[PDB]
Amino acid sequence: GDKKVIQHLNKILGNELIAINQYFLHSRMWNDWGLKRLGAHEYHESIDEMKHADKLIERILFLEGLPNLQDLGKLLIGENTQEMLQCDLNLELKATKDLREAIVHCEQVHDYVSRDLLKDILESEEEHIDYLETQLGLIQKVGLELYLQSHMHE
Amino acid sequence: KGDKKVIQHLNKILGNELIAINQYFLHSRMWNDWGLKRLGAHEYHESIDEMKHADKLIERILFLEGLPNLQDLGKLLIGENTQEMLQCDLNLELKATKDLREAIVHCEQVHDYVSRDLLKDILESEEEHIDYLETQLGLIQKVGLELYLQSHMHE
Amino acid sequence: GDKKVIQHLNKILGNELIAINQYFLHSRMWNDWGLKRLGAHEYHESIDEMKHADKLIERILFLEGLPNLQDLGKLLIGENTQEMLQCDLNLELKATKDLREAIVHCEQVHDYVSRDLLKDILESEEEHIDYLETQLGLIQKVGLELYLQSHMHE
Amino acid sequence: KGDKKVIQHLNKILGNELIAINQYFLHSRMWNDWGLKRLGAHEYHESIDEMKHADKLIERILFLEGLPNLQDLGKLLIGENTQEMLQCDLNLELKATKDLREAIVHCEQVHDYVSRDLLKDILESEEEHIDYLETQLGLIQKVGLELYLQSHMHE
Amino acid sequence: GDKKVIQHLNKILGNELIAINQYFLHSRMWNDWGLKRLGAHEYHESIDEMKHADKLIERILFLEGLPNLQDLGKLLIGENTQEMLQCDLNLELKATKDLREAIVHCEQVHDYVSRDLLKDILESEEEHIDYLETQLGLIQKVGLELYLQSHMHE
Amino acid sequence: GDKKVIQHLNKILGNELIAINQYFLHSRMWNDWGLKRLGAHEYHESIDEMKHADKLIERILFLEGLPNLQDLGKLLIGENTQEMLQCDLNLELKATKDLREAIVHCEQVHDYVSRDLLKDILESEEEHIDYLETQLGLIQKVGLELYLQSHMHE
Amino acid sequence: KGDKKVIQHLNKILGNELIAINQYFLHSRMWNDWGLKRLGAHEYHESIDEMKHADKLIERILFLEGLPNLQDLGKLLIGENTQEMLQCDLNLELKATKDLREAIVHCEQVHDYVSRDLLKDILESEEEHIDYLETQLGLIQKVGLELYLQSHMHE
Numbered sequence A, C, E, F: 001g002d003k004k005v006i007q008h009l010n011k012i013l014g015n016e017l018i019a020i021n022q023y024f025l026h027s028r029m030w031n032d033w034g035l036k037r038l039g040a041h042e043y044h045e046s047i048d049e050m051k052h053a054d055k056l057i058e059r060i061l062f063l064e065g066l067p068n069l070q071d072l073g074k075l076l077i078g079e080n081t082q083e084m085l086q087c088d089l090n091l092e093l094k095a096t097k098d099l100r101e102a103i104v105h106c107e108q109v110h111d112y113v114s115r116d117l118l119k120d121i122l123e124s125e126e127e128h129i130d131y132l133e134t135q136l137g138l139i140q141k142v143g144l145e146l147y148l149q150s151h152m153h154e
Numbered sequence B, D, G: 001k002g003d004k005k006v007i008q009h010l011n012k013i014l015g016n017e018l019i020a021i022n023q024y025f026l027h028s029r030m031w032n033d034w035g036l037k038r039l040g041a042h043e044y045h046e047s048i049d050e051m052k053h054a055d056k057l058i059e060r061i062l063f064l065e066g067l068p069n070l071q072d073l074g075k076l077l078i079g080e081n082t083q084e085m086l087q088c089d090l091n092l093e094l095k096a097t098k099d100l101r102e103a104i105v106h107c108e109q110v111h112d113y114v115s116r117d118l119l120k121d122i123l124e125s126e127e128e129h130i131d132y133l134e135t136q137l138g139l140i141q142k143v144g145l146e147l148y149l150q151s152h153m154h155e
């Protein structure tokens, strides 16, 4: 296994671990506030990052690397709905930047299978960006209070 | 063979349908992009409905030994926000129904009653779309834009 | 969204829009002639291009570009079965050349998700080339009239 | 009670249907005799369809208090091979659709919109038969007679 | 919500976050080595701790505290099966010690619902200790190689 | 059809044809010895290579090349379980090296569909490497005799 | 355990199966590439049948404590067109049946009746393939090449 591939994979893994915890707390904060539709959607975002982390961990071990679950970077926790969505978007913008750099290196050393894995993750993070920009746009179009009312009931 | 002006009329209606297919499809995907899923879904079905009308016109023209024209695409009326998109669709349908009425007058004149019947059914369907569009613009007036948009976020 | 990526996506979208109308007209001409197997197969080629156009429109909008459904290029309409098939093949060869150029650029600017979308379109257009070259070969092997007889009934 | 000329027109269309019923039924059984079962089955359903139009005309005539004429049977156009039988069918239908258009014109003139509608349904059906006939004749040109016949041996 | 209760709950939550990652890595390590029965059981232990973390997080927010998902303590990662089992046991002995001290304080300030939450977690951690002590005892009774062989197949 | 792409595809095909026979004979040798679990797994590995060979043959023909099913290279046949596993691994390490070289060339000439096929085969061969290294690892962890015993029954 | 010449005969028959597997698989995929899908599907099943024969020989060789030979691959008889591919298959089957008869003779001689019974089963399957092949070549003679090909386009 290419040593820099493993470093890149461990970097993506670290990003997934931030997102898991950030989205899970954001989910439970929205549930606490009675914004149950946002809570449920954000729960699922968290679960999806868990599954990516699993796939990264499996690949690192196959390549005889050591998965790093010890290092947890900075959680971006907002204190209201609009900040929380922006915090999620900031984290995903960093995530996709790291994914593209990892893919470049995989291509260079011909680790095409690792590249394929990261690209699938990358498509999933861009779908999350799509959702997030759409939510932030809806807040601008209908206003904050109507956006929140629309996410009360599941 | 077909009456030459009937075939010209049929190709004109076909050209209108081809505009509407593309206009509604883009508007539909714009509304999905914005997270206005109820509008996106409804507008997708309007696009499909115009595709089916275009199919029937193509089939009729070929039966009449005419040449269907799928090459000349007229001007799409693409709006930049929900209220503009609805008015753009409405303007397109007012032109559409005017052309359908003139086509029906000519078919009647030359006794092409089957083409007339085809066009009358397309006409009823475009008037149903006009009903929808006038109702949507009327609702924007009665409840306001933001509430109208909120009501179209969720399918 | 990268500016040339959006231009390439709009170019492929333009090719899809030509194919949709070309295949649809070819389909209904074959039905008009009583060659129902050709008409049905060609109808499904048109539908398949409609679904590719849809995905391209969606990706362009996500990248904050403007989908161009206004410019309709030159339809290659044949006068008989053999010309219709060759017209379809001419269109597909142009289409795949454009797809390869779009993929090269996506790879260059690290738009791997757009690359993946175009590669899936590309595989579908190569399957259509396989079908078309096979049909033209059968016309040579069994002759035109037997080929047409084999396509009267669905 | 009904308009005198409308009833005359309806009886004329009825007479055209009575010819087609008998012509198509004989052509069907001839194709079956020859082992061209696909043609024989299709032609059988053409005959049945004309029977149904005949019934609807009879019922309308009786409602309008006219006398349906089933006694006068015009000239059957019988072919002696497949290409002739198809062209004979096509010649009959070209005459039938001409008569249908003239009847619709007169129904419209005297405001018998229900009779016009019945005739317009028949006309659409006969244009569909014309579509079929012209396509078959076109196929004989495109693939040749013997292959055309072969394609019509099995149902 | 009582301030020291929230501190205790956040301490127990911190123990759960360690256990999640430790058990998840050990599970994927066992799968990597072909010890699928151990890998499957350890995966389930990880999921169980995830669910406890969820309930802790919900309770903290109901009590108007701030759940801490940022501070990840030291993972005890073994290098072979016998060490991994011992690391899990060491972790659970620390977890139940902290659980007991959290329950003492809840009782003292009459937060009987938090006490009940913690007692349910405690029973599940004591079930895990029963499992661990039993596995270590089986290594002693049958030997390490038979123990491993018995955990190859699910 | 690019000429060196075809040569690369025929080279990968040649590797598949070796693996088909090597794995089939290994399967039947394990069945003859009563190591039925190994026999079944190796039969499925052989069938998987048969399917990759079919896809490669179909692609070569579409690209108007001549599939070469006449040149069969050297089968690596072991005479006990541990040698047969190592023979399979040696063959797959050679296979994956050739696959990466074929992908490099396909990327160079913009044959992205062929690259995508070859990348799917590579993922499957890396899964086989994972299986093979895991088996060799188990033999070291539990011993050869326990490993063989665990593979008597399906 | 097994007679040494029996094992040589079984390895020879196995070598013939390995040629047929590859030859029929390639011919199958050639016919699919050409759109002759009925021939491609039939030829595929012939390849799979030879694969199963090869498996039974391998198993019998190992039971007899022989070494199955999957390394030596003889000459594939690949044709350039349908007529040649069919004849290439037939030429391979005439050599295969000749070798099967010689193997059966030797099995009978040394009282390896279970090996004879295996080879006899394979022989019957190879004669069914000869029956198929001679029938196809005869049909090409009776209806003409192009009609034979047309009959094998659709599955």
Ligand code: HEM
Residues within 6 Å of the ligand: B018, B021, B022, B025, B048, B051, B052, B054, B055, C017, C020, C021, C024, C047, C050, C051, C053, C054, C069
């Ligand atoms: C921008 C151009 C177009 C787009 C994006 C588009 C898109 C689509 C889509 C997504 C479908 C559904 C396919 C499926 O999921 O099965 C569809 C169906 C269909 N399209 Fe189009 N289309 C376009 C143009 C046309 C045109 C120009 C015609 C005919 C002249 C046409 C005729 C049809 C028909 C007949 C159907 C089947 C409708 C039904 O019965 O459900 N389309 N189209």
Ligand code: HEM
Residues within 6 Å of the ligand: D018, D021, D022, D025, D048, D051, D052, D054, D055, D070
């Ligand atoms: C005034 C002339 C005729 C009229 C109004 C008439 C009317 C009808 C009608 C309404 C049906 C039932 C159709 C359905 O609902 O599917 C029918 C069936 C049929 N007709 Fe006629 N018909 C006429 C003459 C003939 C003639 C001249 C023949 C043969 C030479 C014929 C042969 C048949 C046959 C075989 C059936 C199907 C009966 C069964 O097996 O159920 N008809 N007809």
Ligand code: HEM
Residues within 6 Å of the ligand: A017, A020, A021, A024, A047, A050, A051, A053, A054, A057, E017, E020, E021, E024, E047, E050, E051, E053, E054, E069
């Ligand atoms: C704050 C830390 C975490 C929390 C609160 C959490 C929470 C949860 C919850 C509540 C579930 C649903 C369990 C059920 O009831 O079925 C779940 C599932 C799961 N978790 Fe976590 N989790 C965390 C971290 C992780 C990590 C770090 C990983 C892997 C590296 C992970 C991997 C998984 C997987 C693979 C599933 C099953 C997903 C599926 O296939 O549906 N989790 N988690």
Ligand code: HEM
Residues within 6 Å of the ligand: F017, F020, F021, F024, F047, F050, F051, F053, F054, F057, G018, G021, G022, G025, G048, G051, G052, G054, G055, G070
């Ligand atoms: C020693 C040579 C080979 C042997 C003994 C062998 C044996 C077998 C057997 C026993 C089966 C299962 C058949 C059944 O029970 O239905 C099979 C399936 C198959 N074989 Fe082979 N085979 C060989 C070589 C090949 C080659 C060279 C190819 C293609 C290039 C091939 C292509 C296939 C395919 C496509 C299947 C079906 C796989 C599926 O979809 O399940 N085989 N083979």
Ligand SMILES: [K+]
Residues within 6 Å of the ligand: A146, A149, B147, B150
């Ligand atoms: K509201």
Ligand SMILES: [K+]
Residues within 6 Å of the ligand: C146, C149, D147, D150, G147, G150
């Ligand atoms: K024929």
